[PDB]
Curated annotation (Swiss-Prot), chain A:
Belongs to the pyridoxine kinase family. The lineage of its organism: Eukaryota, Metazoa, Chordata, Craniata, Vertebrata. The active site is at 230 (proton acceptor). Induction: Transcriptionally regulated by Sp1 transcription factor. The keyword Kinase applies. Its cofactor is Mg(2+); Zn(2+); Co(2+); Mn(2+). Pathway: Cofactor metabolism; pyridoxal 5'-phosphate salvage; pyridoxal 5'-phosphate from pyridoxal: step 1/1; Cofactor metabolism; pyridoxal 5'-phosphate salvage; pyridoxine 5'-phosphate from pyridoxine: step 1/1; Cofactor metabolism; pyridoxal 5'-phosphate salvage; pyridoxamine 5'-phosphate from pyridoxamine: step 1/1. This is Pyridoxal kinase. GO terms for cellular component: cytosol; extracellular exosome; extracellular region; nucleoplasm; nucleus; secretory granule lumen; specific granule lumen. It comes from Homo sapiens. Its main location: cytoplasm. It is linked to Neuropathy, hereditary motor and sensory, 6C, with optic atrophy: An autosomal recessive neurologic disorder characterized by childhood onset of axonal, sensorimotor polyneuropathy affecting mainly the lower limbs, and adult-onset optic atrophy. Clinical features include progressive distal muscle weakness and atrophy, significant standing and walking difficulties, areflexia, neurogenic pain and progressive visual impairment. Optimum pH is 5.5-6.0.
Length: 307, 310
């Protein structure tokens, strides 16, 4: 038929983050995705410099209005990510509500960007007054959430130390509304070694209500990447759509695609930088286009273990 | 590569025109295309309704300011299309003029959007005070322009009544600046019927030996009973791409471009008729180019139309 995705995320002229990381991948996979750029910057804030303007509530509403007037406010998925403005996010919520009112089956894939951890623990890189809005108004509306450990901790108030406390916290989120919760990265240890970050997933469905929990030990890459979480949420949406009731497979293809892309990025980043020289943010920009075939049909280089 | 392209055009949420019609295709063909969205509307202005905001001179300058501070102002191509502000257009010209100081080998592909013609009568749909800026500043800086007939007559000053006047206009356009001039559409006579639009190509280049030569082509394309939007931008985009792959063969660049456009519209029209259903003209929404569904056609266009050598 036709799968339309409304994607309200950031836009950078140069590089791949927000809608730049989310759009191409989703188009290559056959999704009619529409990109509302919550901001337009020359590049991500991971660089020394950056310039750009921002889209305010009034404008997002103005834009949604045009879609409504034309009777084009019927979607199958809504995708959202990083937001700094409290009022902006409220407006986003009002939009999703009406989009779900228009189509009762619409899926809201929310990546609750609040902050991350470095070494021991983290710090939020978003106004704190936004946390309440997420717990109360955003997550309840969301059907799929993809937070990292630190964000899953902030949304639940419960700190995570082990695979079991993580499932407990994921279980809490589920009761908040999300039928699919995926922790995209964590400090949890792996039997594979110290060079492995851990992904955990949890999906609630009926077949008769039944759960499906999966685990994944992904090898770390010696560098900091931007736009990877957005690409994760974006590809999760895609493969979950193509393989419903199979979180295992959907996650294996998602993480695998991330693998290939980063594998190619780090390589070009090394050859482009000096051997023995830490690549710069610019050299570490996801080699998105060069990864078209991996995104289309990613070679599964990772098996998720059922919990 | 990577082959870098700066595309400063319009963006819309729903549908494909401007940056939305050019980005996916070029990304699919491996081009690292950075998009500077000049405006952000809900949809194109062909729908009953449309709301949105627009980018202005300063913001475009600021966005450019960031790219420069990070030493990211080195591109292989610059792609521009429908511009609405004499102010914005001047800022674009200043930017393209610096990207060329930064990299002399840079290629500016400019679609001089001015207007078009319907049933014979042509008129503009952009501020008239834009024509001087294009003539004196934009075209001189261009390397590949893709104006339709009307814009070709406006840029040169000579109405095009036959294939002869077209070619004379192209020579004129060449003298103005760009070595590649493609008249994306014209209602010239075709030895195949009335329902055929004509495309004309002309490229100037010096070969290995060093002799400056010119290759000219002509394509007679059958008309689809419908009015689409984004096709001109898609044409300029693919031209940028195919001339890149086949630098010294304008006949192949064009054959592929026009053929890609064919497969897209062919799939778009039949998928629009089913949507509007038997009898009813397809609405502007049902006629939105079926871009993501034509991925395979963009990557490797099956050539359905061979150009005529002039
Ligand atoms: N350094 C890395 N090494 C290996 N994989 C990585 C690395 N960084 C990111 N990834 C991949 O990207 C995915 C998302 O991780 P990241 O830590 O980038 O997102 P998050 O921080 O989990 O998301 P967000 O910051 O939006 O809340 C990881 O699951 C992994 O597949
Ligand atoms: N109705 C149509 N039937 C057949 N082909 C079309 C039709 N409309 C557009 N095309 C194709 O798209 C190309 C661009 O034509 P269009 O008339 O859409 O652009 P232009 O008007 O030439 O460009 P611009 O609007 O920027 O001045 C044509 O050369 C042709 O290949
Ligand atoms: C006023 C106006 N400008 C520009 C366009 C864009 O056309 P193109 O993609 O062929 O340049 C349209 C399409 O309907 C239009 O109505
Ligand atoms: C504008 C903008 N949007 C989103 C992100 C998160 O990747 C960043 C990270 O630096 C950013 O700068
Ligand atoms: C905002 C906006 N920008 C560019 C174009 C050119 O197709 C249109 C056509 O309708 C538009 O609406
Ligand atoms: Mg992280
Ligand atoms: Mg036209
Ligand atoms: Na995440
Ligand atoms: Na044209």
């Amino acid at each position: 038929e036709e799968c339309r995705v409304l994607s309200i995320q950031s836009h950078v002229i140069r590089g791949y983050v927000g809608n730049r990381a989310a759009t191409f991948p989703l188009q290559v996979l056959g999704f009619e995705i529409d990109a509302v750029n919550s901001v337009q910057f020359s590049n991500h804030t991971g660089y020394a410099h950056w310039k750009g303007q921002v889209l305010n509530s009034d404008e997002l509403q103005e834009l949604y209005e045009g879609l409504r007037l034309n009777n084009m406010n019927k979607y199958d998925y809504v995708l959202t990510g990083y937001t700094r403005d409290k009022s902006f996010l409220a407006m986003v919520v009002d939009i999703v509500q009406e989009l779900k009112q228009q189509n009762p089956r619409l899926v809201y894939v929310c990546d609750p960007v609040l902050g991350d951890k470095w070494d021991g623990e983290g710090s939020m890189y978003v106004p704190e007054d936004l946390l309440p809005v997420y717990k109360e108004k955003v997550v309840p509306l969301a059907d799929i959430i993809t937070p990292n450990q630190f964000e899953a901790e902030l949304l639940s108030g419960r700190k995570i130390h082990s695979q079991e406390e993580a499932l407990r916290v994921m279980d809490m989120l589920h009761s908040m509304g999300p039928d699919t919760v995926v922790i995209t990265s964590s400090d949890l240890p792996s039997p594979q070694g110290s060079n492995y970050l851990i992904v955990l997933g949890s999906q609630r469905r009926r077949n008769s209500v039944v759960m499906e929990r999966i685990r994944m030990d992904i090898r770390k890459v010696d560098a900091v990447f931007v736009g990877t979480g957005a690409l994760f949420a974006a590809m999760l949406l895609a493969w979950t759509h193509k393989h419903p009731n199979n979180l295992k497979v959907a996650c294996e293809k998602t993480v695998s695609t991330l693998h290939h892309v980063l594998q190619r990025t780090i390589q070009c980043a090394k050859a482009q930088a000096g051997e023995g020289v830490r690549p710069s943010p610019m050299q570490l920009e996801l080699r998105m286009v060069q990864s078209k075939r991996d995104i289309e049909d990613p070679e599964i280089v990772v098996q998720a273990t059922v919990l």
